[PDB]
Structures are given as structure tokens and as C-alpha cells.
Design a protein around this nucleic acid. Structure first.
Length: 179
DNA sequence: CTGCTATAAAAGGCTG
DNA sequence: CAGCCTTTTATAGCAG
């Protein structure tokens, strides 16, 4: 297509390998908060890579907001180090990229009303509920949110190649419905 | 503007 | 048990 989807968000998980005292973490770490009555984890943030972590008493952690796999792992290690420095016997076990989000612009308006008819088996489009056509692709297994503006969001990927494969698969289809 | 509408994914505690 | 809740991010509609 000559168009490369840009990564906008990465969700990763890692296991610190030890029970954690969320109250202690919340009290001592800057940009760390804990309100068990609202959510069961410590919400911690760092400005670089700009991300947000959810740290559970179990030792498991969720890292969100990075723009790349590297940046996601880098952020996860920084959060792990913070917990480690606090005094907990933290490890860095089974780090894994769980979801990746990409977006691009095909630079032409799309006749979503048309796409939905021909690709009924993969599309959900109710403009009065949400303006984007939701395309549930099978191979690769990725969900695309296709807009009239020609903007496209792709999500559900574990590796970037899946975002690229999905976009390359949809491109010839969107061209067939230029508005 | 805010907070909804929809998408994926994980963590784990909570309600139904 | 299932499903909600929170967190992130592109996208773009809506009522207040």
C-alpha cells in the first residue's frame, strides 16, 4: 500500500515474582496511588517512556501506553526497578506483549455503507451507535475500526507483523469502496 | 469541554 | 460461575 500503520499503544504484562504491599508502594513511590475501594491495584506513572502501570499485590503488573515493544519493556523494567529499590524481592518473569494498537490514513473517504454489504460476514456497522465500521478479520485475527474519513485503527495484535498483514489485507478492499 | 458511545488486551477483586 | 471495573490509545459521533 505504501502506508505503514503507526503504533499508538502497547499493553504488556510481567510477573515480579513476589507478593507486594500496595499500601507501602503507594506511600513511598512518587506518582503511585492506591485506592482498593476503587480498584485493586497501585496505579503508577512515569514520564519516560510515558506510560501507566497497574501493580497488583500478587506481584503481577500491567504496563500500558508505550509506542513500541522496546519502549513497553523499558517502561516495565523501570517500574520493576522502583518496586525492587523499595525493598521487595522483585524479578522480571514472563514479560509479554499482550496487545498492540496501530493507526493510519488511506487518505480518501470510504463508503462504509457499501463495505458493510459486501463484507457482511466480517463487518458491524451501525453509524447511529458508533461512526466506525468494525471489521473482524480472521487472518490475521485483528479488529479494524474503519472510518469515513479514511482513518483506520487496528487492534488485537501480539506482534507488529499482524498489524501490517491486517492493514495490507484491508487496503485493496477499502480502495474498492472509495467515496 | 466532559463523558458517553465501540475496539483489543491483561491483571484480580468485586457484584449478580 | 459470568461479567464489571480500571488503565491505555488511535478514531469520530452524540447530549449537556
Amino acid at each position: 500500500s505504501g502506508i505503514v500503520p503507526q503504533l499508538q499503544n502497547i499493553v504488556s504484562t510481567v510477573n515480579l515474582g513476589c507478593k507486594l504491599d500496595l499500601k507501602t508502594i503507594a506511600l513511598r513511590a512518587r506518582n503511585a496511588e492506591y485506592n482498593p475501594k476503587r480498584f485493586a491495584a497501585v496505579i503508577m506513572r512515569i514520564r519516560e517512556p510515558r506510560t501507566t502501570a497497574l501493580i497488583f499485590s500478587s506481584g503481577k503488573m500491567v504496563c500500558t501506553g508505550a509506542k513500541s515493544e522496546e519502549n513497553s519493556r523499558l517502561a516495565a523494567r523501570k517500574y520493576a526497578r522502583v518496586v525492587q529499590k523499595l525493598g521487595f524481592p522483585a524479578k522480571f518473569l514472563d514479560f509479554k506483549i499482550q496487545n498492540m494498537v496501530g493507526s493510519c490514513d488511506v487518505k480518501f473517504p470510504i463508503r462504509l455503507e457499501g463495505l458493510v454489504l459486501t463484507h457482511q460476514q466480517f463487518s458491524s456497522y451501525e453509524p447511529e451507535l458508533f461512526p466506525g465500521l468494525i471489521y473482524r478479520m480472521i487472518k490475521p485475527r485483528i479488529v479494524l475500526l474503519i472510518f469515513v474519513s479514511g482513518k483506520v485503527v487496528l487492534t488485537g495484535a501480539k506482534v507488529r507483523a499482524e498489524i501490517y498483514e491486517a492493514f495490507e489485507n484491508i487496503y485493496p478492499i477499502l480502495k474498492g469502496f472509495r467515496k
